[PDB]
Design an enzyme around this catalytic site. Structure first.
Site, PDB file in Angstrom:
ATOM      1  N   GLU A  32      54.283  42.851   1.738  1.00 44.83           N
ATOM      2  CA  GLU A  32      54.782  44.212   1.645  1.00 44.83           C
ATOM      3  C   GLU A  32      56.244  44.181   1.321  1.00 44.83           C
ATOM      4  O   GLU A  32      57.102  44.176   2.214  1.00 44.83           O
ATOM      5  CB  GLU A  32      54.552  45.029   2.918  1.00 44.83           C
ATOM      6  CG  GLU A  32      53.094  45.353   3.262  1.00 44.83           C
ATOM      7  CD  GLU A  32      52.965  46.127   4.566  1.00 44.83           C
ATOM      8  OE1 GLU A  32      52.662  45.533   5.627  1.00 44.83           O
ATOM      9  OE2 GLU A  32      53.188  47.360   4.520  1.00 44.83           O
ATOM     10  N   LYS A  77      59.369  46.069   3.093  1.00 47.73           N
ATOM     11  CA  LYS A  77      59.777  45.955   4.489  1.00 47.73           C
ATOM     12  C   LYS A  77      61.048  45.136   4.640  1.00 47.73           C
ATOM     13  O   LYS A  77      61.361  44.330   3.766  1.00 47.73           O
ATOM     14  CB  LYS A  77      58.650  45.329   5.318  1.00 47.73           C
ATOM     15  CG  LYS A  77      57.506  46.283   5.627  1.00 47.73           C
ATOM     16  CD  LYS A  77      56.481  45.626   6.515  1.00 47.73           C
ATOM     17  CE  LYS A  77      56.101  46.508   7.681  1.00 47.73           C
ATOM     18  NZ  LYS A  77      54.791  46.113   8.289  1.00 47.73           N
ATOM     19  N   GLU A 130      59.437  39.960   6.955  1.00 49.13           N
ATOM     20  CA  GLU A 130      58.397  40.980   7.086  1.00 49.13           C
ATOM     21  C   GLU A 130      57.735  41.342   5.744  1.00 49.13           C
ATOM     22  O   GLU A 130      56.830  42.187   5.709  1.00 49.13           O
ATOM     23  CB  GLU A 130      59.006  42.246   7.713  1.00 49.13           C
ATOM     24  CG  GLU A 130      59.613  42.080   9.118  1.00 49.13           C
ATOM     25  CD  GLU A 130      58.578  41.848  10.220  1.00 49.13           C
ATOM     26  OE1 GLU A 130      57.386  42.170   9.980  1.00 49.13           O
ATOM     27  OE2 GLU A 130      58.963  41.380  11.330  1.00 49.13           O
TER      28      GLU A 130
END
Ligand SMILES: C[As](C)(=O)[O-]
Length: 316
Positions: free
Chosen positions: A289, A292, A297
């Site tokens: 992702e 993030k 993260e």
């Protein structure tokens, strides 16, 4: 079967439809979403995929009003109950009355839960669909040794009535759990085999109880805290667990592959304290992702956004 958290915060992700297909394709029968995205909800129809439906923290406030909650259940639950196997609704995620990020929301959690559950039962879905909340373990103040597991003194007023509510509707507690960060913060005291489930001998001795992996110790540490807080009958569904491939200390492909593979295998059974029941577990997360922060993260993905697997896992 293991579940997978579907976070959608990337600029390079597959269409929703392809993601579901990819879930079906990889034979993943359990999903966690963090908000009730309709396209996703519409896409799960007839999938036979058990679902954790999340309440986003920004709506917690709204849902302390019974009517907002009613309309919330109507739109997102009753409109789909024929064909979507809602399993749990996770009302709030990682809320703490003492963590800076979420403290002003703690007041909202239990009332939201009551209104949604109240809303849920009126529709007669309370034995299929369990209302609960997903915590992190910042709330646990002590976990060493595991038998000494106890919640932080300053979070008891918050957790206590929530436990009570859960006991009474016979809902489990949801916990997000990352042995990775435990290891990453203290690799001097935590051995990698301990963190990765590869230890032949026990690593932590708890009176007569030996802990071979970091994951077993921590949950049982959670179990001891629940038992001290009148939740000795609560089940725990593990709603996140994952290992990052890059971005920080010990974030590597091999660690990721080891961690996640032993885990998938591990949860076919239980912990040294509660051996019979399997641990319902949701892997975090399906895709990297890239939106993030910080770097690590963006690498919890199990899959690339082009849908090739990172780690070559059997989910069956
Ligand atoms: C770091 As210790 C003495 O709580 O195991």
């Amino acid at each position: 079967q293991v579940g997978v958290c579907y976070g959608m915060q990337g600029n390079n992700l597959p269409p929703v439809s392809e993601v579901i297909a990819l879930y079906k394709k990889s034979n993943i029968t359990r999903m966690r979403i963090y908000d009730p995205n309709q396209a996703v909800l519409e896409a799960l129809r007839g999938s036979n995929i058990e679902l954790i439906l999340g309440v986003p923290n920004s709506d917690l406030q709204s849902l302390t009003n019974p009517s907002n909650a009613k309309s919330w259940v109507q739109k997102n639950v009753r409109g789909f109950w024929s064909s979507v196997r809602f399993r749990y609704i996770a009302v709030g995620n990682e809320i703490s009355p003492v963590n800076r990020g979420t403290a002003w929301l703690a007041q909202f959690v239990l009332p939201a839960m009551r209104n949604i559950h109240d809303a849920i039962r009126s529709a007669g879905l309370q034995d299929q669909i369990k209302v609960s909340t997903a915590i992190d373990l910042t709330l646990v103040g002590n976990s060493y040794p595991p038998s000494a597991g106890a919640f932080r003194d300053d979070v008891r007023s918050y957790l206590n009535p929530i436990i009570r509510f859960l006991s009474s509707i016979r809902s489990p507690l949801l916990a997000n759990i990352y042995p990775y960060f435990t290891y990453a913060g203290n690799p001097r005291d935590i051995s990698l085999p301990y963190a990765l489930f590869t230890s032949p001998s026990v690593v932590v001795w708890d009176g007569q109880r030996g802990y071979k992996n970091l994951f077993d110790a921590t949950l049982d540490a959670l179990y001891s805290a629940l038992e001290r807080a009148s939740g000795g009958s609560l089940e725990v569904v593990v709603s996140e667990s994952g290992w990052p491939s890059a971005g920080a200390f010990a974030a590597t492909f091999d660690n990721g592959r080891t961690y996640l593979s032993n885990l998938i295998q591990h949860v076919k059974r239980g912990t040294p304290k509660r051996p019979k029941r399997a641990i319902e577990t949701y892997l975090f997360a399906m895709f990297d992702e890239n939106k993030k922060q910080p770097e690590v993260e963006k690498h919890f993905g199990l899959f690339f956004p082009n849908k090739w697997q990172k780690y070559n896992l059997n989910f069956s």
